UniProtKB/Swiss-Prot annotation, chain A:
Induction: By pentobarbital. Expression is negatively regulated by repressor bm3R1 at the transcriptional level. Changing residue 186 to Q: Higher activity in the hydroxylation of highly branched fatty acids. Changing residue 256 to A: Contrary to wild-type, significant decrease in the formation of the high-spin complex via substrate binding, and decreased substrate-induced reduction potential shift with saturating concentrations of arachidonate. The record marks 256 as: Important for catalytic activity. Changing residue 84 to E: Ineffective covalent modification of the heme macrocycle. Extensive formation of Fe(II)CO complex in the substrate-free form. It is found in: Cytoplasm. Changing residue 381 to W: Large decrease in the heme reduction potential in the presence and absence of substrate arachidonate. 10% reduction in efficiency to couple NADPH consumption to substrate monooxygenation. It comes from Priestia megaterium (strain ATCC 14581 / DSM 32 / CCUG 1817 / JCM 2506 / NBRC 15308 / NCIMB 9376 / NCTC 10342 / NRRL B-14308 / VKM B-512 / Ford 19) (Bacillus megaterium). This is Bifunctional cytochrome P450/NADPH--P450 reductase.
Swiss-Prot record, chain B:
Changing residue 395 to E: Ineffective covalent modification of the heme macrocycle. 2-fold apparent limiting rate of flavin to heme electron transfer for arachidonate-bound enzyme. The gene is cyp102A1. Changing residue 258 to H/K: No significant stimulation of NADPH oxidation induced by addition of fatty acids and no hydroxylated products, but cytochrome c reductase activity levels are identical to wild-type enzyme. More negative reduction potential with dithionite. The chain holds residues 4 to 456 of 1049 of the full protein. Changing residue 395 to P: 10-fold increase in binding affinity for lauric acid. This protein is a target of protein engineering. Its selectivity-directing and activity-enhancing mutations have been extensively studied and the designed mutations allow this enzyme to act on non-native substrates and/or in order to enhance production of synthetically desirable end-products. It comes from Priestia megaterium (strain ATCC 14581 / DSM 32 / CCUG 1817 / JCM 2506 / NBRC 15308 / NCIMB 9376 / NCTC 10342 / NRRL B-14308 / VKM B-512 / Ford 19). This is Bifunctional cytochrome P450/NADPH--P450 reductase. Transmembrane segments: none annotated. Changing residue 80 to F: 800-fold binding affinity for laurate as substrate. High coupling of NADPH consumption to laurate formation. Very much more effective in indole hydroxylation. Favors omega-2 hydroxylation. Changing residue 322 to V: Substrate binding affinity increases 5-10 fold and the turnover number increases 2-8-fold for palmitate as substrate compared to the wild-type.
Length: 443, 449
């Protein structure tokens, strides 16, 4: 009944615990010591970190809890505005944009994006085909090139041309630096940081606003946003919110997905039996020079590989909730209306009462039957109506790309890479490098 | 442009294809062979059976198509009259009764019915608690006992007392036999059927007399929490008129018909799929045990049975118990850019085939996976139509789902279930679907009520 709490620093409470460059991993170690729930206090804030499926399944009851904006999301809101990811459920523009954008993110809508996804995927394969002997691949760097270009092209028919560049597009230079400022604000004379923050926002707004005005018909999210009408209110999105959605998609739909592909390839080369099984499926299914949409749907084991990578290292590692009314959590922890919760997704996914004792082992077979998995044990894309709208976009892209990678190359962990997980607002294996030996299969 | 059509029987055209005791399943096999649309002809009848979401989403455009009375509904109309289910949209009594009855069927209105639903649900659980060892449960029989008694009690405060009976109430014998005659007339006029006509009329009077007597007795003036009170006191905001007593009897007959066998079929199919998929049953049983913490479920607790509702929707996907509805073109129009239709042309929506459209659901359409419904927004529009379409959709949808969720939740809370015969799915067809001969054994968890 009495809730554990990690060590405190006087008036700063638990806040200095987050003044570390791997805060999610630090919070995981605290959950290892304190268990399924612990209070976390900072000046002017109290929240509770949940780690067990037993409690999180209650937290996912939408009649009792709604999405809360974490401090990280509040800081992101300063440039993502009331886009889907940084708006409250009760804000008019959330449900409005939600209704308008849902059809453009369906499994059926992936059929229209598939050709543009293949466009970027082929560029990745050709880059690796064109490496010299003994050259190596910087995996998260190239995965980010792919996912950024894919969302730019599928999102608003814009080619960032990341595979033609060493220095990334000036838009994401500001975006990454804005996200870095948002995260660093958490861990805290700083007047220069404020001036820098506004300059990075202006870079993002101007480019996006230019593309909207330039456009104002293709098979991209922008067209759907300019012409879509909310069935409920009958209203279309206004131009300001449309810019926020584009910024949101550019943020929300590149770095989490590239982290997924990076972790997936990491786990594959660290588990050669799993890599072989996935590569055998890729050769068995991808019989054409270009994968088709239906083919990608047949890459079942590759899809399991991705889910298992999302289990161990979910690249959006937490989300926040608040109690809609007074309620009792787990029959032991009474909560008042407005009390806040954090779902520590990587710790949830290590709940031995759900996954067995081998939680740290990479076994895609865990996901052969979704019905064998208890409710709310696997939450890499969030929960309920506030779940990731881009889930099917992310999984189709990652399955297509990973399938093509496994079809066309053998991979070598030539440095015996030691996993080092860099933390921004997302997770990625820093410095992960491999060598790819081409199988000489043409495109 | 050229439309497929199944084999013909000379002058009878395709009609003998329906002279089979499983016509829906036969039409499903025809759709498997011919695809998303096929013409079906009978003497004096032409229709087109739709099976793909691509075509059915257009058919569900209410600006282009309106509800048509199928031949099945026309025969039901001989005793359901101009009740809600057997009336044309343009008939004055449809919109009148629709406006009057809609508030008494809302999700909000279920709060007032909940106690009566629990009354019958407790009777079901107590019957199963009182079985002897190695005795078994006749599932659709007991589900029909429950859903009939629930609509009788919630409908007009009448207790059929089905759990005290082997032979059903004389009203229900006539109703089923009237429904059988209506369905048999589709398969079918000569002197051999003359006894059928006299019996049909005898069954109509049995239904009318009971209902009309109940209406007259109540008009003592007492007020209960039932549809009958709402119908005697409700006024259509449009016309300012209340329903007359004749239409009220047709509505009561309609509710007893429309809302007992479809709901009991749902519960029967749901339990069947549960015992055939132990992983799903375990997951559903965990939720029931966690949520239903009191001896009597509350309304709010039933709303918390999310996975149970997912189980019900997935059972409704595979075997929608009202398996079809009919439409007609309001004007000349082209369906799917290739099938031109003239005003008055008829369409049938073959719901079980729609729910097997691989282009919507993937290749695993035949597998029972409630997780398909984990997030409702992933379901395309008009891909899932177990309750019909638009303003002519099932008015009792919220009633049926609340009853079925409450009862299934209580069943999973109180018993472990065994498929002791390794039951082989055999779907009996009336105007609705049910798994004939489905039996299980229940081992009580000894949780008191
Ligand atoms: C592996 C890749 C991805 C992961 C792990 C992921 C994860 C998540 C999570 C956990 C949330 C819930 C956040 C919260 O509750 O605060 C979320 C929301 C969201 N994601 Fe993703 N995501 C991924 C890819 C994408 C993509 C590709 C897009 C866009 C194309 C996208 C757009 C969004 C949006 C708009 C929301 C907010 C939805 C709403 O609240 O209406 N994400 N994502
Ligand atoms: C799982 C259970 C049920 C299913 C699958 C179901 C299915 C349907 C379908 C498909 C229709 C449309 C018929 C057509 O378009 O020709 C319909 C209409 C109707 N149902 Fe149900 N139903 C169920 C339960 C109920 C219940 C419990 C009631 C009453 C308490 C009810 C009363 C009605 C009525 C009155 C209509 C006609 C509505 C109108 O046209 O105004 N049904 N139902
Ligand atoms: O744990 C986190 C991680 C942020 C989640 C990632 C956001 N995402 C969602 C989708 N794509 C990215 N954030 C807390 C830390 C904190 C706790 C207490 C006091 C101050 C800060 C917060 O921001 O409140
Ligand atoms: O497909 C059907 C099934 C009837 C659906 C059940 C009605 N329901 C709705 C809600 N609760 C019951 N009926 C056709 C068969 C037919 C076709 C051509 C010629 C003659 C008969 C029809 O009746 O017209």
């Amino acid at each position: 009944k009495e809730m554990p709490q990690p060590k405190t620093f006087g008036e700063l409470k638990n806040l200095p615990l987050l003044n570390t460059d791997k805060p999610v991993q630090a919070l995981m170690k605290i959950a290892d010591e304190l268990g399924e729930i612990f209070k976390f206090e900072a000046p002017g804030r109290v929240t509770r970190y949940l780690s067990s499926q037993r409690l999180i399944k209650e937290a996912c009851d939408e009649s009792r809890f709604d999405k809360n904006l974490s401090q990280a999301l509040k800081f992101v809101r300063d440039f993502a505005g009331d886009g889907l990811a940084t708006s409250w459920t009760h804000e008019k523009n959330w449900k409005k944009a939600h209704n308008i954008l849902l059809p453009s993110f369906s499994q059926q809508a992936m059929k229209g994006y598939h050709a543009m996804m293949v466009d970027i995927a082929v560029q990745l394969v050709q880059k690796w085909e064109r490496l010299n002997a003994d050259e190596h691949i910087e995996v998260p760097e190239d995965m980010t090139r792919l996912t950024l270009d894919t969302i730019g092209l599928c999102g608003f028919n814009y080619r960032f041309n990341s595979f033609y560049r060493d220095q990334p597009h000036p838009f994401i230079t500001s975006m990454v630096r804005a996200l870095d400022e948002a995260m660093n604000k958490l861990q805290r004379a700083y007047d220069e940081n404020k001036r820098q923050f506004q300059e990075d926002i202006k870079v993002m707004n101007d480019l996006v606003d230019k593309i909207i005005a330039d456009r104002k018909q293709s098979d991209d999210l922008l067209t759907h946003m300019l012409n879509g009408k909310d069935p409920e209110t009958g209203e279309p999105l206004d131009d300001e919110n449309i810019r926020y959605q584009i910024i949101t998609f550019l943020i929300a739909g590149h770095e989490t997905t590239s982290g997924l592909l990076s972790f997936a390839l990491y786990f594959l080369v660290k588990n050669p039996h799993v890599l072989q099984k996935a590569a055998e499926e890729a050769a068995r299914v991808l019989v054409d020079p270009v994968p088709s949409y239906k083919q990608v749907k047949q890459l079942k084991y590759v899809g399991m590989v991705l889910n298992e990578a999302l289990r161990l290292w979910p690249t959006a590692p937490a989300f926040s909730l608040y109690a809609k009314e007074d309620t009792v959590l787990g029959g032991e922890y009474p909560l008042e209306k407005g009390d806040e919760l954090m779902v520590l997704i990587p710790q949830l996914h290590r709940d031995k009462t759900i996954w067995g004792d081998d939680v740290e082992e990479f076994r895609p077979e865990r996901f052969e039957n979704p019905s064998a998995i208890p409710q709310h044990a696997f939450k890499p894309f969030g929960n309920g109506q506030r779940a990731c709208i881009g889930q099917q976009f992310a999984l189709h892209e990652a399955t297509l790309v990973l399938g093509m990678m496994l079809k066309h190359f053998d991979f070598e962990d030539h440095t015996n890479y030691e996993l080092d997980i860099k933390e921004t607002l997302t997770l990625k294996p820093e410095g992960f490098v491999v060598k790819a030996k081409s199988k000489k299969i043409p495109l």
